[PDB]
Design a protein around this ligand. Structure first.
Ligand SMILES: Cc1c(COc2ccc(CN3CCCC[C@@H]3C(=O)O)cc2Br)cccc1-c1ccccc1
Lengths: 122, 124
């Protein structure tokens, strides 16, 4: 039975650092990327749309331009891992990874950003 | 390209009534039940899961208990509509119809609920 699992449904991270958030899906043999769809989003806001072997960078929310990537080697292990670099306060909230690979499921991940006083300022 | 489509991405409904919320996907010649997943949910609460060829209520949020149906019958025709009965004020918000069938897509629908003062005065 196809499910997506997260080893951590919550991450606490420091402002400016990098994070990698992970969804696991079953891969028993050679990854068939023609059958694989990985979608990552924070709102509403798209971060990854990986259909049949490539990103659709076209549709990615501006706020994730070049700070966000899916580690494609990790995919072969059944690990859709989104790495975000240079973490901002705006990156805090609910993420969703949706994966389809002979089955379909998704999981929710919550990200908290701790920041020093200097950084938090409106 | 695989796309889920919604005729109406806004519904307005009266407290106490039933509502049917439409969502459509393309079928080829035959529906392969085994490759169709449908999830309906609202604000990250599962309303319904259709996996394999069965309605699956395993993660159903209690709020929706016994008030939600998707018609197996109509899946053949590319129709994945959700039927909510006895609409509450707490049913208002953003719904998502998520569908894997060969490809994968989801679309959002906003639901507004009108109610009279007695019902609004839930309140508490
Ligand atoms: C819904 C889903 C997906 C959905 O993937 C997509 C969702 C939307 C979209 C649409 N996308 C949105 C941003 C703008 C560009 C583009 C468009 O509108 O043409 C693409 C994918 Br892939 C992927 C993997 C699994 C599931 C799934 C399906 C059923 C149950 C559990 C998960």
């Amino acid at each position: 039975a196809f499910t997506v699992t997260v080893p951590k449904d919550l991450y606490v991270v420091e402002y400016g650092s990098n994070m990698t958030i992970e969804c696991k899906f079953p891969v028993e043999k050679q990854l068939d990327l023609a059958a694989l769809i990985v979608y990552w989003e924070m709102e509403d806001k798209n971060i990854i749309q990986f259909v049949h072997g490539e990103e659709d960078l076209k549709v990615q929310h501006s706020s994730y331009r070049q700070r966000a990537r899916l580690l494609k080697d990790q995919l072969s292990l059944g690990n859709a891992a989104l790495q975000i670099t240079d973490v901002k306060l705006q990156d805090a909230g609910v993420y969703r990874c949706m994966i389809s690979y002979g089955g379909a499921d998704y999981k929710r991940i919550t990200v908290k950003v701790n920041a020093p006083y200097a950084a938090a300022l409106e």
